[PDB]
Amino acid sequence: MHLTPEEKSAVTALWGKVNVDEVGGEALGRLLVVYPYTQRFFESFGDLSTPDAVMGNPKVKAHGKKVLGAFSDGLAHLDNLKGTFATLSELHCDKLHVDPENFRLLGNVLVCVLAHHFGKEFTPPVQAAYQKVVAGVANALAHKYH
């Protein structure tokens, strides 16, 4: 991707320390809490009436694991995000009807989760590389919309 080699390594190096299980669920639960309008896509997940109901909803957590596993996969192909996500792009447009603005919201929430999770290790330059990656993933996922 349009990341310097230094940035590419920084991303990878940190990602290795991420518990995709844990982080996916926190990232999708916080999206649902901070931006409640996003709940619109998950009526079938059950109760999302409160912060606590959202954070502890197992469908939330399981879907988060799924989202983040797909996210993790694109990290192995920073060079062909478009290619890694074409299928998922079509699915999200044609089958799910998700406005792609949501991909951007999720990207910023994830940045916040990584910062919370890593503290001081999530330095300005590391965040900057991560900002480039989340933007890259939202564009790749928005790519097949029509």
């Binding site: 447009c93 009807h97 406005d99 792609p100 919201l105």
Partner: protein, 141 residues
């Protein structure tokens, strides 16, 4: 924040729209769907083809709310309350879309009111639509 001048401008331009409101409404929706395809993600249950009755019908509802909003320009919050409820609790349209529709309404107005669409009125209308938008997403969270 609408000045008296703005309110004056809006009442005036919307006045000339008159009876054509609903037509412009549907025109604006069509321009939106074609120009910013992502907005179609909110109407999967709609026939989005040219002249769809669904679009014509929807566009009339949208023009009617706007007419209502011009009539109560001094108390949009209360005048639009049920609509802000619906948007916040049911529809849940991401706020960037409001800016897309507002742009397409100005386009419609420009293309139909050459004499009336002066810089000053354009400026007023832009601000008015931004305010309606703020009202409509005021209860999001």
């Amino acid at each position: 924040v609408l000045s008296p001048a703005d309110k004056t401008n809006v009442k005036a331009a919307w006045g000339k729209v008159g009876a054509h409101a609903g037509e412009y409404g549907a025109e604006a929706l069509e321009r939106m769907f074609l120009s910013f395809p992502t907005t179609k993600t909110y109407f999967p249950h709609f026939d989005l083809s040219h002249g769809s009755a669904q679009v014509k019908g929807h566009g009339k509802k949208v023009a009617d709310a706007l007419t209502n909003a011009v009539a109560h320009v001094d108390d949009m919050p209360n005048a639009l309350s049920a609509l802000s409820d619906l948007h916040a609790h049911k529809l849940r349209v991401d706020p960037v879309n409001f800016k897309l529709l507002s742009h397409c309404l100005l386009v419609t107005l420009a293309a139909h009111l050459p004499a009336e669409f002066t810089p000053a009125v354009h400026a007023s209308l832009d601000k008015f639509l931004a305010s309606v938008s703020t009202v409509l997403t005021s209860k999001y969270r």
